[PDB]
CSV table of N, CA and C in Angstrom, one decimal:
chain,number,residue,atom,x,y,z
A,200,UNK,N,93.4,102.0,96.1
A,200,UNK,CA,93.1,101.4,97.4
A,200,UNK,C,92.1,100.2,97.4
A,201,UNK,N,91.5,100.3,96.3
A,201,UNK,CA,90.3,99.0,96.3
A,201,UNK,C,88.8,99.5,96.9
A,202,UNK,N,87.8,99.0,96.4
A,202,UNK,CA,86.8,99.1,97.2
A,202,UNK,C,86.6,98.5,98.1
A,203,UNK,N,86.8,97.4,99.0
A,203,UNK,CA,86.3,96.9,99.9
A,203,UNK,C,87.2,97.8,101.2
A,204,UNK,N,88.3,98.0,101.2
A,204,UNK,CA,89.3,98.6,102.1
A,204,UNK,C,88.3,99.9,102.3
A,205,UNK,N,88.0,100.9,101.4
A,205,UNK,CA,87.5,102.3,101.3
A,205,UNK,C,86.0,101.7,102.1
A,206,UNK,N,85.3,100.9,102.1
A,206,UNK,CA,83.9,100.6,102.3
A,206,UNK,C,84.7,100.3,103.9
A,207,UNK,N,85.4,99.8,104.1
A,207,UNK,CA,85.6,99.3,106.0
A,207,UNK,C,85.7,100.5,106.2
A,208,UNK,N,86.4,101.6,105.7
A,208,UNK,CA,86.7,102.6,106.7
A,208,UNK,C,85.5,103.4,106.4
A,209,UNK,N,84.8,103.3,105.6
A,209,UNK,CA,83.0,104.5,105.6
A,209,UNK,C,82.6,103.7,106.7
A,210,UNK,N,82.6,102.4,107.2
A,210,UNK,CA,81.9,101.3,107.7
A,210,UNK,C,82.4,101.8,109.3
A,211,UNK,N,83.6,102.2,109.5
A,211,UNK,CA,84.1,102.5,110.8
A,211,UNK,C,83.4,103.7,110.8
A,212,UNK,N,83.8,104.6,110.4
A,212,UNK,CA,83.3,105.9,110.6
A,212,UNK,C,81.9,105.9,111.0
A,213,UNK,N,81.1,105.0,110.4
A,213,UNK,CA,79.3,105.0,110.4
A,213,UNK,C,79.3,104.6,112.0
A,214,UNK,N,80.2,103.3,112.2
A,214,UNK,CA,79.8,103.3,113.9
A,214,UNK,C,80.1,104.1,114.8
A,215,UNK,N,81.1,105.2,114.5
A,215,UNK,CA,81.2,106.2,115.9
A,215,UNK,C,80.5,107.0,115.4
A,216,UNK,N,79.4,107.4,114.8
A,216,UNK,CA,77.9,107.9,114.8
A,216,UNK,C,77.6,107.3,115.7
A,217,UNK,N,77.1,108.7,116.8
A,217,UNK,CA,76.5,108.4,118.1
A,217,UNK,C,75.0,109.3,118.7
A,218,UNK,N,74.3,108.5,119.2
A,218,UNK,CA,73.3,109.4,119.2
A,218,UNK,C,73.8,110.1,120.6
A,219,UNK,N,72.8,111.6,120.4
A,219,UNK,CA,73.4,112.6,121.7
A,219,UNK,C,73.4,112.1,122.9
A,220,UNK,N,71.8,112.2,123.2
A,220,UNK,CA,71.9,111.4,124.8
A,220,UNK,C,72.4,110.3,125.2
A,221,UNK,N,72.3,109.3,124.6
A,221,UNK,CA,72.2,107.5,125.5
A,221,UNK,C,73.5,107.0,124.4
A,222,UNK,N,74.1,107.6,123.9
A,222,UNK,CA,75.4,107.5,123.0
A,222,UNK,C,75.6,105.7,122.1
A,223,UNK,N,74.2,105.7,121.9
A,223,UNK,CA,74.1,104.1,121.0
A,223,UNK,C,74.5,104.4,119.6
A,224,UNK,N,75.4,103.5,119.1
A,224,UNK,CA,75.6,104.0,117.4
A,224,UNK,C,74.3,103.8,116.7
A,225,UNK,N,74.5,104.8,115.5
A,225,UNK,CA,73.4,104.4,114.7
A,225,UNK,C,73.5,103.6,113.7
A,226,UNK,N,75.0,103.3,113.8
A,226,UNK,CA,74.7,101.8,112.9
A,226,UNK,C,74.1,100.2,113.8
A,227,UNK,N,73.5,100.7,114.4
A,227,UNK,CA,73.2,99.3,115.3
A,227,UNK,C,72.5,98.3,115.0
A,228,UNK,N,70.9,99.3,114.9
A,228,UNK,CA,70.1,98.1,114.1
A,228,UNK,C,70.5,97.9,112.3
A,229,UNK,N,71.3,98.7,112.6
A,229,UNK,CA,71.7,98.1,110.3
A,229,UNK,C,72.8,97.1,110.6
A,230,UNK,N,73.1,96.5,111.8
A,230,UNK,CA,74.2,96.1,111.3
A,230,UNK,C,74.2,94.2,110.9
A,231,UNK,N,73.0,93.9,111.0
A,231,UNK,CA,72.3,92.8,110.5
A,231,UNK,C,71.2,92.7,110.1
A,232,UNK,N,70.6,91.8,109.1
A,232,UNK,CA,69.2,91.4,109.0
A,232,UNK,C,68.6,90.6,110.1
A,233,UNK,N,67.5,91.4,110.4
A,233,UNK,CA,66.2,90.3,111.5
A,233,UNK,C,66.3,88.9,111.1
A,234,UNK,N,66.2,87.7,112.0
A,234,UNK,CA,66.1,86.7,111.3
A,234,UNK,C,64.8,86.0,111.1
A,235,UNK,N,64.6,85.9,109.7
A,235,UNK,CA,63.1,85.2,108.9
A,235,UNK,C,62.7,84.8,109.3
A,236,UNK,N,63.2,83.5,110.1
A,236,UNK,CA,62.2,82.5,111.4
A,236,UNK,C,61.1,83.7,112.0
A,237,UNK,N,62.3,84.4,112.6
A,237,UNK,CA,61.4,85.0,113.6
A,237,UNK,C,60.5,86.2,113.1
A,238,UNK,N,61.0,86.5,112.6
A,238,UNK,CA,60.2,88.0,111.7
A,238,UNK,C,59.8,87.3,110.2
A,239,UNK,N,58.5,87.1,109.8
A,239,UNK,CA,59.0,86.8,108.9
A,239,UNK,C,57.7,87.8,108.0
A,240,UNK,N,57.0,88.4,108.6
A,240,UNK,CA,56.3,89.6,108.1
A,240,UNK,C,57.4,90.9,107.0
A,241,UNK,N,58.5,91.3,108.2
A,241,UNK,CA,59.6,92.1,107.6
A,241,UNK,C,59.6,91.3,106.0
A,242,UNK,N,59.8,90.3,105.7
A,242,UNK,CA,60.4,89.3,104.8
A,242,UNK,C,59.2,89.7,103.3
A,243,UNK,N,58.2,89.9,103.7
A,243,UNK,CA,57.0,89.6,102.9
A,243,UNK,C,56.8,91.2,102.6
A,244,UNK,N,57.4,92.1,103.4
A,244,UNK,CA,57.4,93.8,102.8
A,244,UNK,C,58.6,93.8,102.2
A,245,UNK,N,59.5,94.1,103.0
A,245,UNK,CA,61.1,94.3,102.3
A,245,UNK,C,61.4,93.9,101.1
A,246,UNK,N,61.2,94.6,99.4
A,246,UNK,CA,61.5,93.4,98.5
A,246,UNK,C,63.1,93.0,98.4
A,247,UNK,N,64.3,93.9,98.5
A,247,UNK,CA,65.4,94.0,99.1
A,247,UNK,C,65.6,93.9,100.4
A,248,UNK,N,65.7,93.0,101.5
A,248,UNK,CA,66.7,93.2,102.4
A,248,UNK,C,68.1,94.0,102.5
A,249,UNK,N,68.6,94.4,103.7
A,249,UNK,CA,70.0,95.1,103.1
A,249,UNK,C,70.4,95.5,104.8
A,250,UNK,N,71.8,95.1,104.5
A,250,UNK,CA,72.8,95.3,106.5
A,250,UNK,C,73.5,95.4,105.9
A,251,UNK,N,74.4,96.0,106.8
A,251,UNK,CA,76.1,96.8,106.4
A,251,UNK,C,76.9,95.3,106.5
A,252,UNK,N,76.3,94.0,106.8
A,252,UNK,CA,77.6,92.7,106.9
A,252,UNK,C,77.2,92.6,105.2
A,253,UNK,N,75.6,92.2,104.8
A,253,UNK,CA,76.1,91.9,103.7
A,253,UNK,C,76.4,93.2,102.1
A,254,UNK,N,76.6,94.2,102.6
A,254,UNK,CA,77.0,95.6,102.0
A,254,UNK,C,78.5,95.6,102.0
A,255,UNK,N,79.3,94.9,103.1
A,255,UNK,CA,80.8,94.5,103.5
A,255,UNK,C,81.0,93.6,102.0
A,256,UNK,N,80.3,92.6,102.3
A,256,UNK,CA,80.5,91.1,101.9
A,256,UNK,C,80.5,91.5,100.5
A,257,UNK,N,79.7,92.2,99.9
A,257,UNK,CA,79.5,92.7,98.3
A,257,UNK,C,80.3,93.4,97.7
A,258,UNK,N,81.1,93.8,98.6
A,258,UNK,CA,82.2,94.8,98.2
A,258,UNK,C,83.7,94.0,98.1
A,259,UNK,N,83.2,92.9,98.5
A,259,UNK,CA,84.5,91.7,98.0
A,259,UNK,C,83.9,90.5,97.4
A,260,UNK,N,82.7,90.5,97.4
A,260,UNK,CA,82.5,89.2,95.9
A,260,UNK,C,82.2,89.7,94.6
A,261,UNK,N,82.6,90.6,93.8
A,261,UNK,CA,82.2,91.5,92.5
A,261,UNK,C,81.3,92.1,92.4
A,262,UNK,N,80.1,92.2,93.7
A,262,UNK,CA,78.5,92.6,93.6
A,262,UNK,C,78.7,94.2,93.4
A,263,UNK,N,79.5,95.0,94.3
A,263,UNK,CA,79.9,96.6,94.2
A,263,UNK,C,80.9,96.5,94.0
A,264,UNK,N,81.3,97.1,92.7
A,264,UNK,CA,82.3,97.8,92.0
A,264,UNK,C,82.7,99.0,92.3
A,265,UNK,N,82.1,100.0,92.8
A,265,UNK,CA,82.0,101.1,92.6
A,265,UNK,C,81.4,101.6,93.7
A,266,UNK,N,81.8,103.0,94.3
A,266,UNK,CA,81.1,103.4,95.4
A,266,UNK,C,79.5,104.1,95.2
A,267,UNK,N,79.2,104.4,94.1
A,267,UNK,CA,77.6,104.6,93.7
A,267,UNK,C,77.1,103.6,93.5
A,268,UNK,N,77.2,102.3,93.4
A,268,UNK,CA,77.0,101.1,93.9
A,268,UNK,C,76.5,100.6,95.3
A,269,UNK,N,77.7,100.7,95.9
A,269,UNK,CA,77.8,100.9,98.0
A,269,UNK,C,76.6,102.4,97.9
A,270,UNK,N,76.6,103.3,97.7
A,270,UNK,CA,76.0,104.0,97.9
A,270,UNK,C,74.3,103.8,97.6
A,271,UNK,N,74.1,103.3,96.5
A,271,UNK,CA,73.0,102.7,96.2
A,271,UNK,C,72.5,101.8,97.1
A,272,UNK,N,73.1,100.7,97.6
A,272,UNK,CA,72.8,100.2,98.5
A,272,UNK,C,72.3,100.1,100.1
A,273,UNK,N,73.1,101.4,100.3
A,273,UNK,CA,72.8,102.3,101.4
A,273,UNK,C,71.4,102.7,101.6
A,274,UNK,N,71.1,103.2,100.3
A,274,UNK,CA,70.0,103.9,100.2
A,274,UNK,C,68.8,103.2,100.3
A,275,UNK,N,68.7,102.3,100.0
A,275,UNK,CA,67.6,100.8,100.3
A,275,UNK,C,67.7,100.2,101.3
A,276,UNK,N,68.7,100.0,101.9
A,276,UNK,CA,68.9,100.0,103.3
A,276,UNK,C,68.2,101.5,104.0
A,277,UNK,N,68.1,102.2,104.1
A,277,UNK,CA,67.9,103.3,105.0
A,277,UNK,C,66.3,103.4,104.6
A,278,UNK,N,65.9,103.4,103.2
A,278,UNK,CA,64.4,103.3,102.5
A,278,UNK,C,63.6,102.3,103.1
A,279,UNK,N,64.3,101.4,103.6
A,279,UNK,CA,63.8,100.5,104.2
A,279,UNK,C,63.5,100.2,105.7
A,280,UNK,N,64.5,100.8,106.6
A,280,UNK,CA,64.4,101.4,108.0
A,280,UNK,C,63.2,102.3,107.6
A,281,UNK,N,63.1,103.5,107.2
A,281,UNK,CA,62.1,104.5,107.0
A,281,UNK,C,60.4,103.5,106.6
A,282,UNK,N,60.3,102.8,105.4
A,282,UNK,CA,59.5,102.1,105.5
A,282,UNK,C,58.5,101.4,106.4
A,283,UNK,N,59.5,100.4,107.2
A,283,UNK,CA,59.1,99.9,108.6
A,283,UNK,C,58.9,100.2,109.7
A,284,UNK,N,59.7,101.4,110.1
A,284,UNK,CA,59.6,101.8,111.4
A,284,UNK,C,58.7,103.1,111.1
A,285,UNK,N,58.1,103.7,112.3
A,285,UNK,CA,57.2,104.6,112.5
A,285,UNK,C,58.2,105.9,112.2
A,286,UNK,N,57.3,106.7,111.5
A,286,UNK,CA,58.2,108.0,111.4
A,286,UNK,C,58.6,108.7,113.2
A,287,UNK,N,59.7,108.9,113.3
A,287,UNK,CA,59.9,109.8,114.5
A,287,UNK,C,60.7,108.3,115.7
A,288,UNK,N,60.2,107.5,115.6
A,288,UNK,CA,61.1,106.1,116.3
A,288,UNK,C,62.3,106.3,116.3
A,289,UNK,N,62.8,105.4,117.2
A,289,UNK,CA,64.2,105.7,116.9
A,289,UNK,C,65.4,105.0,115.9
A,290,UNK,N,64.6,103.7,115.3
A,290,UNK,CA,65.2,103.2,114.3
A,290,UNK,C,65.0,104.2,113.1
A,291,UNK,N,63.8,104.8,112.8
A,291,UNK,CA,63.6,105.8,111.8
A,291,UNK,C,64.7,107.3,111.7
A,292,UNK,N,65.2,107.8,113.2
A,292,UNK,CA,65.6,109.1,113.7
A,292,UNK,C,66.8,108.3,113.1
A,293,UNK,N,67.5,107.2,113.4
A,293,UNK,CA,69.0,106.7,113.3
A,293,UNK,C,68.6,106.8,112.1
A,294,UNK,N,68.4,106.5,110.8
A,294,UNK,CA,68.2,105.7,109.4
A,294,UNK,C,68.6,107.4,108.5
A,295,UNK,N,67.7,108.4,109.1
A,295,UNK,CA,67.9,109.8,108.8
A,295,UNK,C,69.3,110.5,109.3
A,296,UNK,N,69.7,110.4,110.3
A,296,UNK,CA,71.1,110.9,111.0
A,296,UNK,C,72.3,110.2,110.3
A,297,UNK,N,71.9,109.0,110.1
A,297,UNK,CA,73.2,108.0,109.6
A,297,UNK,C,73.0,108.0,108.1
A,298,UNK,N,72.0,108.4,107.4
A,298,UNK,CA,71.5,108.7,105.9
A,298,UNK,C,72.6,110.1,105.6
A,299,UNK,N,72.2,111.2,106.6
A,299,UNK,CA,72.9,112.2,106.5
A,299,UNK,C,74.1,112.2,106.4
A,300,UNK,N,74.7,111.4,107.6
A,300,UNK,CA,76.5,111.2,107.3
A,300,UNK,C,77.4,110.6,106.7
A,301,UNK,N,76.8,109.6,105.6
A,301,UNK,CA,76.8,108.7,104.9
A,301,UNK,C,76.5,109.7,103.0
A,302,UNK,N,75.8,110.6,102.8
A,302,UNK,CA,75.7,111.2,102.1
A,302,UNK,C,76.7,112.5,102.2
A,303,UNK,N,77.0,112.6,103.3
A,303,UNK,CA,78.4,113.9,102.9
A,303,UNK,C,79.8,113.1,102.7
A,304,UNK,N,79.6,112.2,103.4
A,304,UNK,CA,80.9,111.5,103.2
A,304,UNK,C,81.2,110.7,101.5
A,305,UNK,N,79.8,110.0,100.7
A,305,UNK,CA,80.3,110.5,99.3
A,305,UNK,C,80.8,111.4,98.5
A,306,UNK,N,79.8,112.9,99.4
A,306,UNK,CA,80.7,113.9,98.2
A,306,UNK,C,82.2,114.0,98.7
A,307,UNK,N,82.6,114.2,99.9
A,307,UNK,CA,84.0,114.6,100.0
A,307,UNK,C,85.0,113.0,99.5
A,308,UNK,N,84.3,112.7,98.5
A,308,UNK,CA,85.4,111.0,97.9
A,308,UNK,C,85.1,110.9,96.5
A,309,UNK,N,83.7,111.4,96.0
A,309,UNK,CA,83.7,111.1,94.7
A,309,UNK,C,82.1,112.2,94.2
């Protein structure tokens, strides 16, 4: 199937992750980086940046090979939500709920 094809469809799946009440996906705030102009404190913590466009994009220029790769990626992405945001926020609650469904869906693939 290819990696990039298998990475769109984890990538679908992550957006109908929905929170219970106010039904916002929890891929929302991952689904770009802040822009440095404006944030540029984030810039000066974060030694990795990381969003699901350019986690897409990696999975079709030779950067991920391999879904423990994508997976790795993830994980500093979400390390990094957790970092910034206050424990219990809702960027933090999404980073753990969308960490969780993101981690069962490797085992049931590899």
């Amino acid at each position: 199937l290819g990696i990039f094809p298998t990475v769109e469809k984890l990538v679908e799946e992550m957006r109908e992750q929905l929170d219970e009440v106010d039904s916002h996906p929890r891929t929302s705030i991952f689904e770009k980086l802040p822009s440095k102009r404006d944030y540029p404190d984030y810039f000066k913590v974060i030694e990795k940046p990381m969003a699901i466009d350019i986690i897409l994009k990696n999975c079709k220029n030779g950067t991920y090979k391999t879904l423990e790769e994508v997976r790795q990626a993830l994980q500093t992405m979400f390390e990094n939500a957790r970092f910034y945001n206050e424990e219990g926020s809702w960027v933090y609650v999404d980073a753990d709920k969308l960490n969780e469904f993101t981690d069962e869906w490797f085992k049931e693939h590899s």
